[PDB]
C-alpha cells in the first residue's frame, strides 16, 4: 500500500510529492529529501522548474535568518520512492534529492517561533524571477532525532560542602536510575544524604529544568517538593519520582516543543544529540537536587537525556 503527500499551487499548474515529512537525523548523517515533481510543460513555457529546501530560523526578536538554503532545477534537469512515483506519474515527472548536511539544528517549536524546514517548489524562466503566491507550492517538513540505541552510564553525581562553621561536612549523592528517559516515563532520583554537621536539612527541592541553548534558556518543566528532613549526625535515603509533561506547562511562554507541521499538540522538545564531541536551537535537560540547610543552600545537578524511542 503505502501513502505519500501531495500539494499544489492555487493555479493548479504545479504538483509536488513527498513520501515522508519527518526525516530522521542520525548525527553521523542526515537523510535525503527524495521527492518527485509532476509538471505541466505547456503552461510551464518559462522552462526552468526549481525545487528548493530551506531551514528558516524564524525566531522572535521578530526576524528571519535562513540558516541553510538548497536549490535544484527539475525541469529542464533515483531512490525507490523516486522510481515508484515516476512510474506512477508516467512520463512528465522529475526528481529532487536534497541532502541536509550534518550540524544543522533540529525541528523546534518554541511555545507560543523556532526552527523549521520548508520544501518550496515553483516554475520560472530564471532564478531571479519574482516569487508569486499564484505559482509556489510549499511543504513544512521536520528533521528530528530518536533516543540512542545503547545505554550510557548511570548519571551519578555528588558533592560535599565543608561548612566553615562546622568540623565535618554534609556529604551528598544524587543518582538517576538511567540517563535516558522516554517521553511520558517516570524519573527516579535517589537522594542519599549523609550529614555530619550541626546544620539541619530543612527542605528538599527536586526539579527538572529545560536548557534551551539558542544560538542559554532555562525553565523548570517538572517539580517535586518534600519536607523529608535529615537530622544532624544522621543519614537519609529516598527515591523521589517525577515526570515532565505538558499539562501544567502551557502558560510558560517560550518552552521548546517538538516541531509541528501546522499547530498540532507536540511533546516537550526531545533533547538534541550533538555531533561527535552550533546555530539554531540546542536543548538539553538536567535534574536539579537542592537541599536547604539551617543552624541555607547546597545543590547537585544531573544531566539526563529526554528523547523518543525509534518507531517500531
Amino acid at each position: 500500500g503505502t501513502r505519500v503527500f501531495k500539494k499544489a499551487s492555487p493555479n493548479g499548474k504545479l504538483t509536488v510529492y513527498l513520501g515522508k515529512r519527518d526525516f530522521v537525523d542520525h548525527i553521523d548523517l542526515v537523510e535525503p529529501v527524495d521527492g518527485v515533481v509532476l509538471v505541466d510543460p505547456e503552461y510551464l513555457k518559462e522552462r526552468r522548474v526549481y525545487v528548493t529546501l530551506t531551514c528558516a530560523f524564524r525566531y522572535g526578536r521578530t526576524f528571519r535568518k535562513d540558516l541553510f538554503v538548497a536549490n535544484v532545477q527539475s525541469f529542464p534537469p533515483l531512490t525507490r520512492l523516486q522510481e515508484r512515483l515516476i512510474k506512477k506519474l508516467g512520463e512528465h515527472a522529475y526528481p529532487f534529492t536534497f541532502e541536509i548536511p550534518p550540524n544543522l539544528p533540529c525541528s523546534v517549536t518554541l511555545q507560543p517561533c523556532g526552527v523549521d524546514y520548508e520544501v518550496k517548489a515553483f516554475c520560472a524562466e530564471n532564478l531571479e524571477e519574482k516569487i508569486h503566491k499564484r505559482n509556489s507550492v510549499r511543504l513544512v517538513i521536520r528533521k528530528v532525532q530518536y533516543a540512542p540505541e545503547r545505554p550510557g552510564p548511570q548519571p551519578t553525581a555528588e558533592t560535599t560542602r565543608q561548612f566553615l562553621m562546622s568540623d565535618k561536612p554534609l556529604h551528598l549523592e544524587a543518582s538517576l536510575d538511567k540517563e535516558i528517559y522516554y517521553h511520558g516515563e517516570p524519573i527516579s532520583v535517589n537522594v542519599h544524604v549523609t550529614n555530619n554537621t550541626n546544620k539541619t536539612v530543612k527542605k528538599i527541592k527536586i526539579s527538572v529544568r529545560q536548557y534551551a541553548d539558542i544560538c542559554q534558556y532555562k525553565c523548570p518543566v517538572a517539580m517535586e517538593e518534600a519536607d523529608d528532613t535529615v537530622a544532624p549526625s544522621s543519614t537519609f535515603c529516598k527515591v523521589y519520582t517525577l515526570t515532565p509533561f505538558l499539562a501544567n506547562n502551557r502558560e510558560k511562554r517560550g518552552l521548546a516543543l517538538d516541531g509541528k507541521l501546522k499547530h498540532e499538540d507536540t511533546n516537550l522538545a526531545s533533547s538534541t544529540l550533538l555531533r561527535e564531541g552550533i546555530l539554531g536551537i540546542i536543548v538539553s535537560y538536567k535534574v536539579k537536587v537542592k537541599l536547604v540547610v539551617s543552624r541555607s543552600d547546597v545543590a547537585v545537578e544531573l544531566p539526563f537525556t529526554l528523547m523518543h524511542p525509534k518507531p517500531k
Partner: antibody
Amino acid sequence: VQLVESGGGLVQPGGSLRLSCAASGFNVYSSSIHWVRQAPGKGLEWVASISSYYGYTYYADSVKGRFTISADTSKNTAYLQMNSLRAEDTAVYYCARSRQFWYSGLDYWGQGTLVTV
Amino acid sequence: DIQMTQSPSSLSASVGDRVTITCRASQSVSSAVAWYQQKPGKAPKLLIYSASSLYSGVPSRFSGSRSGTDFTLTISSLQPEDFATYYCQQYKYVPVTFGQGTKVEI
C-alpha cells in the same frame, strides 16, 4: 502489565455510581485511559477518554454532561463519576489503555465491571 | 462524527477457512483503523492497528488491508481459538467510534 476494574452495582436511577480502573506496569502520563461500555447483547461504545499528559478530557454525546472522567495521579487509577443514570446506561463497562506517543490502538483492557440500572 | 458501517454482522466458517471483515466509513480517516477481538464475556483485545500493522504477539494469520475507505481485516486461516466478535475502530477523530461488531460461528 494489567488493568483491573470494579465498582459496578445496582443503582437507583437518578443516583450516582463510580467505576475505578487500576493500572499495573505503566503510567497515566505515557498512556491514555479510555472507557468503553457494552450494553447487554449489544456491541461496544466509546464513553470517555482522558490524556492526563495534556489536560484533555473527551466524552461521547450519549453521556455528555452526566459522566465525568478523571485520574488519580499518585496511584495511576482512573475514575468515572456517573451522575444522573438512566435505563440504557446498563452495560459491562471496561477500562482501556492506549499509547500516548503515539496512539496505536487500545492494547490493554481490563475485564471490567457490570453496571445495572 | 463518522459512521462505521460494518458487515457482515455474523458469518459461518470452518477451521482453516478464510474470513474477511469489511469496515466502511462515512469519510476518509487516513489509515487510522484498529481491529479488536472479543470472546464471549472477555475483554476486547487489539489485533491490527494502523489498518495494516500487527500488534506484538498477535498471530501471523491476522492482517489488515486498506482500499480508500474500505478497511478490511483478513484472517488467513481461522483457528478454533479465533471465534469471537470483531470490532473496527476509527481513531482519527473525536468522538471515537466503534463498529457494530462481527461475530463468527461454526
